[PDB]
């Protein structure tokens, strides 16, 4: 079971640099080539870089040519992408994908998101979306930048009928989402529903109860 995970993505300013890593396990890291693939939100997938198994040869797309450098460490089993002179276009979630030479992109990591903006990192403000059959309990993760934010209920124990909507960029220049859960009406007086909000760029974790507060 090949495992690939990215790290190092966050808010970056126009210009400057940022380093990404891909931890590899489940296979012999030197035996198969590695590649990066980026995808802007609402856009298709785009090849960006690729490196040979030993690392003797690196391959770059013309758009990132002369700015990005792909690199490999074989003792640590990790793929690196050093990104330089970053531009607003470079904003995308980049995935590390193992390569079976021809059958490229055989396995895909979840990917880390790189935001290329001049605005500063702001922590989210979580406001309770309390109830007033089927009731709805929710929370409003508002005024955060950049995305993403992870929202779970009861530390992941509540996954039934949970709808976490995509982040929408509001006029202030900050994202804001709302996550709701649909449960029976009588359950509001029995179980207790906790919201788990995570925003890694600001490293702020807020847990708020959803009380009807009649």
């Amino acid at each position: 079971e090949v495992q690939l995970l990215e790290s190092g993505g966050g808010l970056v300013q126009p210009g400057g640099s940022l380093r990404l890593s891909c931890a590899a396990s489940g296979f012999t890291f030197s035996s198969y080539a590695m590649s990066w693939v980026r995808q802007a939100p609402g856009k298709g997938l785009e090849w960006v870089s690729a490196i040979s198994g030993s690392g003797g040869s690196t391959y770059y797309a013309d758009s990132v040519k002369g700015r990005f450098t792909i690199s490999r460490d074989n003792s640590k089993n990790t793929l690196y992408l050093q990104m330089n002179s970053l531009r607003a276009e470079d904003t995308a979630v980049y995935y590390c994908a193992k390569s079976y030479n021809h059958p490229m992109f055989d396995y895909w990591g979840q990917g880390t998101l790189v935001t290329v903006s001049s605005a500063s990192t702001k922590g989210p403000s979580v406001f309770p979306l309390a109830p007033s059959g089927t009731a709805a309990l929710g929370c409003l993760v508002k005024d955060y930048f950049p995305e993403p934010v992870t929202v779970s209920w009861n530390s992941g124990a509540l996954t039934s009928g949970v709808h976490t909507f995509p982040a929408v960029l509001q006029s202030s220049g900050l994202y804001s989402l709302s996550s709701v859960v649909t449960v029976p009406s009588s359950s509001l007086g029995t179980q207790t529903y906790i919201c788990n909000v995570n925003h890694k760029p600001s490293n702020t974790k807020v847990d708020k109860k959803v009380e009807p507060k009649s």
């Binding site: 997938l45 995935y95 059958p103 992109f105 055989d106 895909w108 990591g109």
Partner: peptide, 17 residues
């Protein structure tokens, strides 16, 4: 090659060669 990308997830290899 064909790839399956469920929303908000990584692509999945479906058909090769």
């Amino acid at each position: 090659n064909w790839y399956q990308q469920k929303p908000g997830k990584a692509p999945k290899l479906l058909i090769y060669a």
